UniProtKB/Swiss-Prot annotation, chains A, B, C, D, E, F, G:
GO terms for cellular component: cytosol; GroEL-GroES complex. The keyword Chaperone applies. It comes from Escherichia coli (strain K12). PANTHER family: 10 KDA HEAT SHOCK PROTEIN, CO-CHAPERONIN GROES. Pfam families: Cpn10 (PF00166). Belongs to the GroES chaperonin family. PROSITE patterns: CHAPERONINS_CPN10. Heptamer of 7 subunits arranged in a ring. Interacts with the chaperonin GroEL. Can form asymmetrical complexes, composed of one GroEL and one GroES, and symmetrical complexes, formed between one GroEL and two GroES oligomers. The asymmetrical complex is the functional unit. It was suggested that the symmetric heterooligomer may represent a transient intermediate in the chaperonin protein folding cycle. Another study shows that the symmetric heterooligomers are substantially populated only in the presence of proteins that cannot be folded by the chaperonin. Gene3D superfamilies: GroES chaperonin (2.30.33.40). InterPro entries: Chaperonin_GroES (IPR020818), Chaperonin_GroES_sf (IPR037124), Chaprnonin_Cpn10_CS (IPR018369), GroES-like_sf (IPR011032). CDD domains: cpn10. The gene is groES. This is Co-chaperonin GroES. The modification N6-succinyllysine is found at residue 34. Together with the chaperonin GroEL, plays an essential role in assisting protein folding. The GroEL-GroES system forms a nano-cage that allows encapsulation of the non-native substrate proteins and provides a physical environment optimized to promote and accelerate protein folding, probably by preventing aggregation and by entropically destabilizing folding intermediates. GroES binds to the apical surface of the GroEL ring, thereby capping the opening of the GroEL channel. Regulates the ATPase activity of GroEL.
Swiss-Prot record, chain H:
Together with its co-chaperonin GroES, plays an essential role in assisting protein folding. The GroEL-GroES system forms a nano-cage that allows encapsulation of the non-native substrate proteins and provides a physical environment optimized to promote and accelerate protein folding, probably by preventing aggregation and by entropically destabilizing folding intermediates. Also plays a role in coupling between replication of the F plasmid and cell division of the cell. Belongs to the chaperonin (HSP60) family. Forms a cylinder of 14 subunits composed of two heptameric rings stacked back-to-back. Interacts with the co-chaperonin GroES. Can form asymmetrical complexes, composed of one GroEL and one GroES, and symmetrical complexes, formed between one GroEL and two GroES oligomers. The asymmetrical complex is the functional unit. It was suggested that the symmetric heterooligomer may represent a transient intermediate in the chaperonin protein folding cycle. Phosphorylated reversibly during heat shock. Disulfide bonds: none annotated. Each subunit is composed of an apical domain that binds non-folded proteins and GroES, an intermediate domain and an equatorial domain that binds ATP and is involved in inter-ring interactions. Forms a large central channel that appears to traverse the entire length of the cylinder with no obstruction. The central channel of GroEL functions as two cavities, one in each ring, that are separated from each other by the crystallographically disordered 23-amino-acid C-terminal segments of the seven subunits. The entry and exit of polypeptide seem to be restricted to the apical end of each ring. Modulating the volume of the GroEL central cavity affects folding speed in accordance with confinement theory. Small proteins fold more rapidly as the size of the cage is gradually reduced to a point where restriction in space slows folding dramatically. For larger proteins, either expanding or reducing cage volume decelerate folding. A stepwise reduction in cage size results in a gradual loss of cell viability. It is found in: Cytoplasm. It comes from Escherichia coli (strain K12). This is Chaperonin GroEL. The modification N6-succinyllysine is found at residue 51.
Amino acid sequence: MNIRPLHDRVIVKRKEVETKSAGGIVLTGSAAAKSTRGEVLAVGNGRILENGEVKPLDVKVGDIVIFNDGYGVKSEKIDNEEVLIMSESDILAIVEA
Amino acid sequence: MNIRPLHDRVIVKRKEVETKSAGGIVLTGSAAAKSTRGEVLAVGNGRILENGEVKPLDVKVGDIVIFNDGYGVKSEKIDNEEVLIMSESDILAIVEA
Amino acid sequence: MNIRPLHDRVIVKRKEVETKSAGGIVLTGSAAAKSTRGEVLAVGNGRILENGEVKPLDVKVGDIVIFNDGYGVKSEKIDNEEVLIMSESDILAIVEA
Amino acid sequence: MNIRPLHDRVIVKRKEVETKSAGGIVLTGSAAAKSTRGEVLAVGNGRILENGEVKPLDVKVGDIVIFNDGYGVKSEKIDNEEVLIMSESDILAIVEA
Amino acid sequence: MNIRPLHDRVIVKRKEVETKSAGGIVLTGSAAAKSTRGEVLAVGNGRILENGEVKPLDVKVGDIVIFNDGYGVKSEKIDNEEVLIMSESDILAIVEA
Amino acid sequence: MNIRPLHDRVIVKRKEVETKSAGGIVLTGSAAAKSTRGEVLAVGNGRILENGEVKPLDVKVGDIVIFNDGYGVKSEKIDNEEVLIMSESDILAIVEA
Amino acid sequence: MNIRPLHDRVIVKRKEVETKSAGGIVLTGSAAAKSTRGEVLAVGNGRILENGEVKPLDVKVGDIVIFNDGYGVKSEKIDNEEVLIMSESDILAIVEA
Amino acid sequence: ISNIREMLPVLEAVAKAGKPLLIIAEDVEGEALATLVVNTMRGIVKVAAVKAPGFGDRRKAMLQDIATLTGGTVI
């Protein structure tokens, strides 16, 4: 079963937990931390606020995005895959080229 | 007696508490947790905010939905059935196909 | 003296404290709890917010309603009858048929 | 010197502290409590919010009103008389007939 | 140097600290308290909020006013005179006649 | 390098820390306190809020102003000179003539 | 991979940690502190708030800016370069000429 | 060990292999232990839980010895 986010919501999957290479050739062993990068899988319509229709989100399905792992960030299990659900507000940037 | 939610309110019933199968064949015994999935039973008109009329909700009666078990989530007893009442804001997604 | 609520306010009277029958034939003795159901007695004009006139409330005098016993809920004595005063926001649903 | 409230403000005087009769013929001795009822003495123009002019208040000078003794409620001394100053928001109802 | 308040701001000077006479002829000795009454000395243009121009304040230079000694209330020294600076919001009433 | 505040922001420099003369001829030795007075050096465009354009600030470059040393007040070093950066909201008045 | 901020977001890189010269010729050894100055590298479209389109930011790519190292300020690693991501709100001024 | 989480990955590969599993940890407690019971009690997997032989630095020493005799890796 594929998911369907409810407007203003973005569904992302985390990347690699401290990809073992930071600082060059050095294999940074797990130093108690996580990953802030992720990939878009599904996008809602947009924010409802201000009444006026619904403005679309600025993220297309499949961007590599940097987000803030704040409070509004929730974790879920889909087909036994590790996924995250947050709003656009919690997304900060995109990694292009 | 069937219920009638008061605009912006959604009535849902929880699913299975950690359906004993997570991770494949393994029977995950109750490890102190709950279920975040539910089914829609009744839907109010919509949000009143901004004055302008009342915009309808994006959930039809009978969707399989993922929600956040936050503070705004209340529990009730109808005909001796375990039900939940929250606003659309507390609903995060839908499980389609 | 009958009461007169001040716009957006609803006057309700609680029902039976854990009506002794829950779960079927079993007489659930007072297990330290209250009732969340009530009947409408009087209704104010409506919310003033947004300037634009005053939108009427969605509750008619005499509905059986489910409410949240939150903080905004106050208790009063009228003709020696136990009554409650809260806003529409604190009301969650109606019991119809 | 008679007072003059500053728009949205209402000036009221408390009634009797637990009028000794509650429950019928019984003289309820002071059980550590106060009175929630009061009489209107002076009324301001109205709320300024939303820019658009100033909407008048729904209380005329001389109503018997039920209020919430919240934080916004202040106490004052006029000609040596015990008075209260709060906003319309803190007023909940009127006692008519 | 006379002062000049910055829109929505009111400059007032306190009156007498528990004028020794409360309750009639009795000289109430300083019982650890202050005065809530004051006189207007200077008035700003008005509130900017809502964009639309600037609405003037409802206090003219020289009114005897009752205010709340809240947090927004600050104390200052002008020509060696004890003065107070707060917004209109902190002012509650006027003493007329 | 001269500074450039970013709309709604005001750049001021503090005056004299308890100018040793308070109360007349008496030299008030440093009694653990600071100065609340300052001079304007640079002014931003204005507040953006409400969408509609940008309303200019009510302070011209070079006024003697009284401000509140709140939280929004930050301290900086420019050419080795002690300066302060806050918003117009933190400014309370002007000293004219 | 060069970055792409998500409207209202600004990407900056810190300058020198207490450039060893403060107060003139004196080499201020690291006294436990950081730098508040930075350079702009990338800028988002602008704030969405108020519905009406999207107003552009007042910072062009490459300004020397003074910011507040508040909570909304996050730290990131791009091509092994130390970068910062915050909103325009956290930026206070520009260093021109 | 105290959490069933860490087990799932390996407990799974053992569940689809048929063979039983002995778990020699520093300790096994919490729901982890509690669940492990319900799993063999049903016949999902056959799994045993016993503490490690020894104490302090001697424990890890002796635990390693066991790996050698059985052809496994100390996690």
